[PDB]
Each structure stands twice: as structure tokens, then as C-alpha cells.
Design a binder for this molecule. Structure first.
Ligand code: XSP
Ligand code: 0V5
Ligand code: MG
Ligand code: MG
Ligand code: MG
Ligand code: MG
Lengths: 433, 433
């Protein structure tokens, strides 16, 4: 049923090129765009950039766009497949690319088309996108997720010394998704005033994901500021904390650097055991219920040891790269107990859905995620509701590449009406609701 | 006619509630959202907020949403007017409100519906939105504007001592709108590095509009950084500078305070004459081609004297508030020569089109503008092309409430094909194309 495919370069939320795809059927135009990370795992599917150093500092995506327009488009048009056939269309692309890591076309070329196909397929079925994704995944009973808002940005997403990437608030005690937005926004605005009072107005500019970027160094101080703002806002009993350490970003010679944005000094490196003990303190002193990428993507022993010794959610991101092969190993080694789901780590909607179901079948949580370079696309709002995962991270409640998803989640909750169920304290396993 | 209107509260780009409207006709669903300013002029149409200090810090828009759903929607549906009848539908809302400044329903209520009507009207006409806007305005040409990107900020809501609000770059020498985006993005990334080298990583997080706020007091230092970045990027021949001083934010006792964020000391206040002489130095020393709000919104004498003594573009924003009554005065007094067009300073599409036509009929330029609180809505991209104004300011090339509009302008340039014309060096007077 595909009539025409046309891709172009747009700019993402950091001002870098990315791929957008228009796909036409008899039902109209369906448009999707692809996100892009900065703290990208070494095992992610290849993001194809042009490397023309004069043009966009080598970050153009004209090669991927030309792959879609000149090669992928006719191939899918020639297949005569309906756009409801997500798996057959995705398989066609994966086979035409022919490499393990989508390095011929780029994962960004293939994903852009895969997302546009899924939106077209929804229209073909006369279904909202979240319901079409539920059907693809084999789910019936949809769930609005707890949002995890990154309200202090550090690591590779902000100009400060703060090494850990993300400090998030999860309004598990909210009444609804729309009430979760109010809780998160109120804590965020209260947090601004906490930071301004303590560190001055000049500490309240934001990092790449909209979280404030105060020029602090201690990760316990970020946790302190977040706990203060939750309490000041009146929500101690309703809002808990999650972290994405992104420890691969500061992994240095078998050790870890908590001042990695400062000129090098190997004497400050701590070991993985020292790092884990610091996490145990955070878990004891603050309401931390989830830690993502606490150790490097290859540091398997540290992950399996930490996971065995805590009762909280431990999330694979650069460890697992939304990749069934790496997920199978993490399940076997009990490396973690939740998968961060990033469609662009693996490069297709079908593979991402496969990765989600593999985690869920092994009793893991799944947290759908944005990338730090996002667009105005809102696909992952419909994806998290259709996959019924119960949790999504897609930014602070600041910068509309983040709010576009949160706003779409409010619209979905509205659409579902009395059938809406919010994951609340069952964010790790919302199936019980 | 209109089948259904439904409003809701969504979050804008700073995490504050704003109005979104869904409007249904036999052609389907049309959705629009309303932006919000921070440096708002005293003559703007009223933005209605709920003022419940316990909910969203007083900034809810439940009252505006209720005026739409309980009052405006049934009245417009009762009318039977076709959504092509922009002027009659807007007049109906204006009459039901009955106040000069839209303070019964809120300019935010009325505008939300006005924008959604306009989108549905384009679909009724089987036209893209930019062409429907051009027909509403009586234009049969279409022009892609030069974008003005806000890259360094100061002003009343930034934590540096820098008094002036915005320093913008304009790629007037670009080959196309898509090429303007590349020039803007490359210079913005170059500036980040220039700031990092001079002020430290800690100075490179971003403000509400995606620009940087290093800790500087001297406005000339902002200009110097921007000029260094343009030069370092290789684009000295193709990029010029615009400023938004927002002088109403620092007017004090009949004078002006360029260190207004340090504790009050009237001994440092300068006259409007002193401030005008400073602008003359900027224009001599830097490629400044446009200054917006160089004096207070009531300091008519300074505006007329300055505009008579320079050749640059002088933009009314808080002076004119997209308001035909104020614009008539400014034309008669020769207070300025360009109008900044903000649909939500006046509150309806019809009135904003009348404001643009009044400026253009009197020989002024018009620069379409975002607000500092934006959403994923991209109406103003179609608006600037349909009104053929040649200039738009809608953010740094960072944060997707800004890039949504720039990306949409790239899409329109693509849609126009061989017929696309870029205002380039004719941005002040594009009608010569
Ligand atoms: O918050 C998103 C991520 O950042 P990115 O990898 O897209 O830079 C992450 O590491 O989880
Ligand atoms: C960009 C805009 O800021 P605000 O929307 O805060 O008035 C302006 O003053 O021109
Ligand atoms: Mg990462
Ligand atoms: Mg991560
Ligand atoms: Mg203003
Ligand atoms: Mg202004």
C-alpha cells in the first residue's frame, strides 16, 4: 500500500541534522523523525553521518537520506506489502542492508522509515497509534506510564562538573498521568527556586534534556537538591527518585572518574566497589528506587554483583542497547532487572518490540526512553502506552522536544477515558492492574 | 461548519500550563496551542491564568479552557459559519468577550480557537496553511524569511548582569532558507566553543530560547562574542546581527538602568540620549542591522528621535503590541519602522493579519516572532511565509519548540520547489521580490 517515500534532513533539539521521513498511502501523509544520542554505547546500531567536516561539522545525514529516497523507498514500494505488515517491511529493510549493525544504510535511515510505516499502518487499521502498537506487540489492556523527569542534568548533557548524567523524579503517588505532570512540573519549578536561593540565578540554565545544570560537583548534592524540592513542594509521600549514572562515559583505565569534565587526574579515580558503595549510601539516604548504567557497558561482574545486593530497579541502557543478543546475556548473568528501550539503539520498530517482549517475558521492567538529541516527534508516547511498560523517561518538563511526548501522553490518557489506568506504584510491573 | 471544539491544558516549553484546542470538521482534526511571554508589554491583550497559588504556582489555565469548552465552542458551532470565515468567526469571539483587552475569556482562550479555525479553514480550501494565510491577507506571492536566531541572552529573566535581552544572528547572505539554517547552526555551535574557551564549560548551558548566558555585564562583550563566532565559522560576509534590547524591562524613573540586576543605585542610570549614543556605537562597531525595543513602551520621544537619526531597522514589540491602535500612533510619530508580529499580544489571527497589513501599507518591515514560552505548534512558520514578511525570530537553533518552526520553514521551502524565493539581503523590504 506504499505510494511514495520521501526523506529529508531536519534539525534536532541540539541543532544537529537528523532524518525525517514522509510516507504516503491512500490514507495520507505520515511523518516521523529519528532521535540521536550523545552518550552512546559502543554496541548501538550505526548512526550514519556524512563526515563532511565543512558542513554541519561533519554531522550531515544526506547519505542516510539518499539511501532512503533512492534505495529503500523503491524496494518497499516494489514489495507491494501493506503498511500494517510492520515485521515484513522491517525484515525487508534489515535484509537489504545486510549487515549486523545497519552500517550500509545507517540505523537512522532504516528507523526513520520503520517509524513512518508504523504510523501509516495505524491509519490503515483505523486505530490510534498506541492501539496499533499494542496489537503488534499482542497486548490488550493499555497502561499510562509513570514519567521519570530528568530535573538535574549532568555528565555529557551539561556544562557543570556533576559527573552522573541524570537525576529524575517519578511521581509514583500521582492519581493519573495528568496529575503526574502537575507533580513533576511543580517540583521542577520549586527546584529552580531551591537552586537559585542556594547557588544564585546564574545556576538555573538547563542542560540538553531540560534539567537544571547548577555548577555543582557532588552527586549527593544533586540528590539533596531534588529531595529538598520534592519536600518543599509538598510531595514527599508521592514522588521518588531515579538516576542514570551513564558510567560508561567516565569509565577510565578499569576505574571511574567522578570529575571527568575536569582536566585529567588519575589519582581521583575510584574503583567499581567504591562506586557501588556510594550507590548503597544514596539508596539508604534518599528515596532512590532505580539506577541506570551504574557501571560500564562491558563491566558485567560489577553489574551482576550490584544487582544481587540491592532491592531496587537496576536499568540496562548502554549494557543492553535494546539488542536481543545483549539482553539474553544480561538475563543469564542477572546483570540488571529492567531494559531501557531506545528504538534507535537497535534501528527498527519490530526489533524494539521484540527486545521489549524478551525483557517482559523474563520478568524485567522496561522503561521507554528518548535520546538526548530529540525532535518534535511523539512516537515514543504512543509506544510506551501500546507496550504497556509502565515507565517512560523523556526529559525534564522543560524544552518541547520533551513536553511534546508528555503532552501526547496526556492526550492519550484523555482519549482512553474511564479505561485509562495509571501505573503508579506498579511502574516496574503494571500487568497486575 | 464546525462539528466540535475541545480545549485542554498542556505544558509549554518552560513547564507552565497553556491552552491547546482541538477543532473538528468533516475534513478531520485541527489542533493548535498558545504561546506565552515573560517580558510582556503592559499593553498586551490579557493572558488569563487561574491564580490558584497551590496549583502550578498560580499559572493554571483551567479558566481559559472552561471559557472555550462551555461558552465559545457552543456559540461558534451554533453559528454554522464555515471555518473559511476567519474574520466572522474571530468577530464572534471578540463580541462575546466584549472587553477591549480580551480580559473576560483571556486572549489565550480566544487565540487558541482562532488558530485552530485557521488550520481547518486551510483544509476546507484544500490549501496548505501558508497559502490560506496568504489568501486571508490578500497576498499572492510567498517568500521564505531570513531567520533571526537568539544566541546570547540577558534581560529580566537571566541571571547575568547583562541588561539587554537578546543578541541574534541573521544569515542574510545564505543561498536559501535551508542554507540559512546551516549557517545559523554552524555559528551557534562555533559560539558554544568560543564561550567554553573564554568562560568555561559551566557557561554553556542554555536559556528559555536556546541561547547562552555567560556571566557578562557589558552589552558590547555580547556583541564581541557573536562577532567572534561569525568570523570563526567563516561567515563574516553572510551574517549580520540583530538585537532585542527589551528596554521597558530596565526603564527606571524616566531613565534607564543597564546594571538593573545589581542593587538599586540611581547614580548609574543613563538618559535615553545616553542609551541612544551607545546604540550608535554598536552600529558603528558591529554589523548590527536591527534593534528592537530600544526604549521604553511609553518613551515615544526617544523612539521618534532615534529612528530619525539612524538607518537601521527599528522594531516595535512592547511599543506596538501587534495592536492596530498603537501601530497607528507609531506610524504617525515615525516611532519605528518595523513591527514585531505576535499573534498572542492581540489575541486573534484576523487582528494580527490586520496589524501586519497596516504596518506593510505604511512602509514598515514586519518580523514574525515566537514568545519565550513556546510549544510544539508551528503556526507562525506558515504565518511568516503567507504574510510574505521576509523575517522571523523564533529561537536559537536549539530546543525543539524553536526547531519545530525552523523545520517547518524548511518543509515549506521544499514544498514550493522552483517557486521558492528567499528574502536574503532584502529581508527589510522583501516586496521588491
Ligand atoms: O536520557 C537519554 C540518554 O542520553 P543519550 O544517550 O541519548 O545521550 C541515556 O543515556 O539514557
Ligand atoms: C522573544 C520575546 O520574549 P517574551 O515572549 O518573553 O516577550 C520578546 O520580547 O520579543
Ligand atoms: Mg547515553
Ligand atoms: Mg542512559
Ligand atoms: Mg518581551
Ligand atoms: Mg521583544
Amino acid at each position: 500500500s506504499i505510494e511514495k517515500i520521501w526523506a529529508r534532513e531536519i534539525l534536532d533539539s541540539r541543532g544537529n541534522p537528523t532524518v525525517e521521513v514522509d510516507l504516503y498511502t491512500a490514507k495520507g501523509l505520515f511523518r516521523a523523525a529519528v532521535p540521536s544520542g550523545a552518550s552512546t554505547g559502543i554496541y548501538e546500531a550505526l548512526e550514519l553521518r556524512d563526515g563532511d567536516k565543512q558542513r554541519y561539522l561533519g554531522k550531515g545525514v544526506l547519505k542516510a537520506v539518499d539511501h532512503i529516497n533512492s534505495t529503500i523507498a523503491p524496494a518497499l514500494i516494489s514489495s507491494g506489502l501493506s503498511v500494517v505488515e510492520q515485521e515484513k517491511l522491517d525484515n525487508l529493510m534489515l535484509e537489504l542492508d545486510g549487515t549486523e549493525n545497519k552500517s550500509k544504510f545507517g540505523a537512522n535511515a532504516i528507523l526513520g522509515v520503520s517509524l513512518a510505516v508504523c504510523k501509516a499502518g495505524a491509519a490503515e487499521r483505523e486505530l490510534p497509534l498506541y492501539r496499533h502498537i499494542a496489537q503488534l506487540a499482542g497486548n490488550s489492556d493499555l497502561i499510562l506510564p509513570v514519567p521519570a523527569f530528568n530535573v538535574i542534568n549532568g555528565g555529557s548533557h551539561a556544562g557543570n562538573k556533576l559527573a552522573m548524567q541524570e537525576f529524575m523524579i517519578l511521581p509514583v503517588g500521582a492519581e493519573s498521568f495528568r496529575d503526574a505532570m502537575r507533580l513533576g512540573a511543580e517540583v521542577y519549578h520549586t527546584l529552580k527556586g531551591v537552586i537559585k536561593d542556594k547557588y544564585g540565578k546564574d545556576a538555573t540554565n538547563v542542560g540538553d534534556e531540560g534539567g537544571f545544570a547548577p555548577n555543582i560537583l557532588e552527586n549527593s548534592e544533586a540528590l539533596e537538591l531534588v529531595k529538598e524540592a520534592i519536600d518543599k513542594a509538598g510531595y514527599t509521600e508521592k514522588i521518588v527518585i531515579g538516576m542514570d549514572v551513564a558510567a560508561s562515559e567516565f569509565y577510565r583505565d578499569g576505574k571511574y572518574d567522578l570529575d571527568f569534565k575536569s582536566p585529567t587526574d588519575p589519582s581521583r579515580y575510584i574503583t567499581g566497589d567504591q562506586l557501588g558503595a556510594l550507590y548503597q549510601d544514596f539508596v539508604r539516604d534518599y528515596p532512590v528506587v532505580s539506577i541506570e548504567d551504574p557501571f560500564d557497558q562491558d563491566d558485567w561482574a560489577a553489574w551482576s554483583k550490584f544487582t544481587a545486593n540491592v532491592g531496587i530497579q537496576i536499568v540496562g541502557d548502554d549494557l543492553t542497547v535494546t539488542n536481543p543478543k545483549r539482553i539474553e546475556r544480561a538475563v543469564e548473568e542477572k546483570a540488571c532487572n529492567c531494559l531501557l528501550l531506545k528504538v534507535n539503539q537497535i534501528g527498527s520498530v519490530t526489533e524494539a518490540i521484540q527486545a521489549c517482549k524478551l525483557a517482559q517475558e523474563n520478568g524485567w521492567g522496561v522503561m521507554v526512553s528518548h535520546r538526548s538529541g530529540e525532535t518534535e516527534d511523539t512516537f515514543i508516547a504512543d509506544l510506551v502506552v501500546g507496550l504497556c511498560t509502565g515507565q517512560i523517561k523523556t526529559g525534564a518538563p522543560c524544552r518541547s522536544e520533551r513536553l511534546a511526548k508528555y503532552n501526547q501522553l496526556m492526550r492519550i490518557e484523555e482519549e482512553l477515558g474511564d479505561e485509562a489506568r495509571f501505573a503508579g506504584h506498579n511502574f516496574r510491573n503494571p500487568s497486575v492492574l
